[PDB]
Design an enzyme around this catalytic site. Structure first.
Site, mmCIF file in Angstrom:
data_model
loop_
_atom_site.group_PDB
_atom_site.id
_atom_site.type_symbol
_atom_site.label_atom_id
_atom_site.label_comp_id
_atom_site.label_asym_id
_atom_site.label_seq_id
_atom_site.Cartn_x
_atom_site.Cartn_y
_atom_site.Cartn_z
ATOM 1 N N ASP A 1 -12.417 9.454 -7.438
ATOM 2 C CA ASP A 1 -13.610 10.111 -6.920
ATOM 3 C C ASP A 1 -13.301 11.333 -6.056
ATOM 4 O O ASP A 1 -14.217 11.870 -5.423
ATOM 5 C CB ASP A 1 -14.453 9.110 -6.123
ATOM 6 C CG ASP A 1 -13.689 8.489 -4.965
ATOM 7 O OD1 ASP A 1 -13.580 9.138 -3.905
ATOM 8 O OD2 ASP A 1 -13.194 7.351 -5.117
ATOM 9 N N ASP B 1 -15.327 -3.999 10.354
ATOM 10 C CA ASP B 1 -16.643 -3.595 9.876
ATOM 11 C C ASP B 1 -17.294 -4.628 8.963
ATOM 12 O O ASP B 1 -18.290 -4.314 8.302
ATOM 13 C CB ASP B 1 -16.562 -2.227 9.177
ATOM 14 C CG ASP B 1 -16.232 -2.327 7.696
ATOM 15 O OD1 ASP B 1 -15.413 -3.190 7.310
ATOM 16 O OD2 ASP B 1 -16.799 -1.528 6.916
ATOM 17 N N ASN C 1 -8.485 5.578 3.534
ATOM 18 C CA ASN C 1 -9.255 6.436 2.639
ATOM 19 C C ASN C 1 -10.035 7.495 3.415
ATOM 20 O O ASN C 1 -10.643 7.210 4.452
ATOM 21 C CB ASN C 1 -10.216 5.571 1.818
ATOM 22 C CG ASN C 1 -10.637 6.213 0.509
ATOM 23 O OD1 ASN C 1 -10.935 7.400 0.448
ATOM 24 N ND2 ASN C 1 -10.673 5.414 -0.547
ATOM 25 N N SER D 1 -11.342 11.406 -3.326
ATOM 26 C CA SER D 1 -10.838 11.061 -2.008
ATOM 27 C C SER D 1 -9.345 10.732 -2.079
ATOM 28 O O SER D 1 -8.770 10.534 -3.152
ATOM 29 C CB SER D 1 -11.621 9.889 -1.426
ATOM 30 O OG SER D 1 -11.422 8.725 -2.201
ATOM 31 N N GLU E 1 0.811 -1.211 0.000
ATOM 32 C CA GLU E 1 0.000 0.000 0.000
ATOM 33 C C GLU E 1 0.849 1.269 0.000
ATOM 34 O O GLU E 1 0.533 2.225 -0.716
ATOM 35 C CB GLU E 1 -0.941 0.007 1.207
ATOM 36 C CG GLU E 1 -2.095 -0.987 1.116
ATOM 37 C CD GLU E 1 -3.213 -0.526 0.189
ATOM 38 O OE1 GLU E 1 -3.132 0.605 -0.340
ATOM 39 O OE2 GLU E 1 -4.176 -1.301 -0.005
ATOM 40 N N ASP F 1 -6.000 8.538 -0.076
ATOM 41 C CA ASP F 1 -5.507 7.530 0.854
ATOM 42 C C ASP F 1 -4.260 8.056 1.553
ATOM 43 O O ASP F 1 -3.409 8.697 0.926
ATOM 44 C CB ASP F 1 -5.183 6.224 0.133
ATOM 45 C CG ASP F 1 -6.240 5.844 -0.887
ATOM 46 O OD1 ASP F 1 -7.437 5.785 -0.534
ATOM 47 O OD2 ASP F 1 -5.865 5.616 -2.053
ATOM 48 N N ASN G 1 -7.531 9.261 -5.272
ATOM 49 C CA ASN G 1 -8.438 8.371 -5.981
ATOM 50 C C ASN G 1 -9.269 9.162 -6.982
ATOM 51 O O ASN G 1 -9.383 10.387 -6.900
ATOM 52 C CB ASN G 1 -9.363 7.638 -5.011
ATOM 53 C CG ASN G 1 -8.616 7.004 -3.856
ATOM 54 O OD1 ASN G 1 -7.572 6.383 -4.044
ATOM 55 N ND2 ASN G 1 -9.146 7.162 -2.651
HETATM 56 C C1 LIG Z 1 -8.856 0.497 3.937
HETATM 57 C C2 LIG Z 1 -8.676 1.538 2.859
HETATM 58 O O1 LIG Z 1 -8.987 2.702 3.061
HETATM 59 N N1 LIG Z 1 -8.162 1.073 1.697
HETATM 60 C C3 LIG Z 1 -7.875 1.839 0.506
HETATM 61 C C4 LIG Z 1 -9.079 1.897 -0.458
HETATM 62 O O2 LIG Z 1 -10.011 2.760 0.145
HETATM 63 C C5 LIG Z 1 -8.755 2.326 -1.919
HETATM 64 O O3 LIG Z 1 -9.675 1.767 -2.829
HETATM 65 C C6 LIG Z 1 -7.312 2.081 -2.390
HETATM 66 C C7 LIG Z 1 -6.878 3.098 -3.446
HETATM 67 O O4 LIG Z 1 -5.518 2.972 -3.787
HETATM 68 O O5 LIG Z 1 -6.317 1.959 -1.365
HETATM 69 C C8 LIG Z 1 -6.613 1.305 -0.172
HETATM 70 O O6 LIG Z 1 -6.792 -0.081 -0.373
#
Ligand SMILES: CC(=O)N[C@@H]1[C@@H](O)[C@H](O)[C@@H](CO)O[C@@H]1O
Ligand SMILES: [Cl-]
Ligand SMILES: [Cl-]
Ligand SMILES: [Cl-]
Ligand SMILES: [Cl-]
Ligand code: NA
Length: 129
Positions: A48, A101, A59, A50, A35, A52, A46
């Site tokens: 949309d 969750d 996110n 948002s 990640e 990370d 992202n």
């Molecule tokens: C737990 C969490 O927030 N995971 C995020 C996910 O929201 C997103 O689709 C992605 C984008 O690169 O990265 C991570 O997997």
């Protein structure tokens, strides 16, 4: 801060990620590897709108507030910038809520595509945990 592999596994164990919700420590280390490449300052936008944030790429759509994700939630009740510090406490506490969750670690795209079904134990091999 860019963690070393065994350095990050110790810090994840100290905060209680080892076997949290049934996921062994190797899963969390593997997820952080793919990640963020162990970089606590990692960010990624992202499509949309948002973002990370941090070692586990949490996110802002649901879990933290960054002031620029309209219509989002702040379920971990933290500023997203807290997820970028060299202390991973905020990230680990928020990851405990995410993984609780219902969907487990599938909330992390990199874990589902690159760790799930692999020898995640290799990521904590040789570490004086
Ligand atoms: C737990 C969490 O927030 N995971 C995020 C996910 O929201 C997103 O689709 C992605 C984008 O690169 O990265 C991570 O997997
Ligand atoms: Cl493991
Ligand atoms: Cl916002
Ligand atoms: Cl830490
Ligand atoms: Cl699960
Ligand atoms: Na948010």
């Amino acid at each position: 801060k860019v963690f070393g592999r065994c350095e990050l596994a110790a810090a994840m164990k100290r905060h209680g990620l080892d076997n949290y919700r049934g996921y062994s420590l190797g899963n969390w280390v593997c997820a952080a590897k793919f990640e963020s490449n162990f970089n606590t300052q990692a960010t990624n936008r992202n499509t949309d709108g948002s973002t990370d944030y941090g070692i586990l790429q949490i996110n802002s759509r649901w879990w933290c507030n960054d002031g620029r994700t309209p219509g989002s939630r702040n379920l971990c009740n933290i500023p997203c910038s807290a997820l970028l510090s060299s202390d991973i406490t905020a990230s680990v506490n928020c990851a405990k809520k995410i993984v609780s969750d219902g969907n487990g670690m599938n909330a992390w795209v990199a874990w589902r595509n690159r760790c799930k079904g692999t020898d995640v134990q290799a990521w904590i091999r040789g570490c004086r945990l």
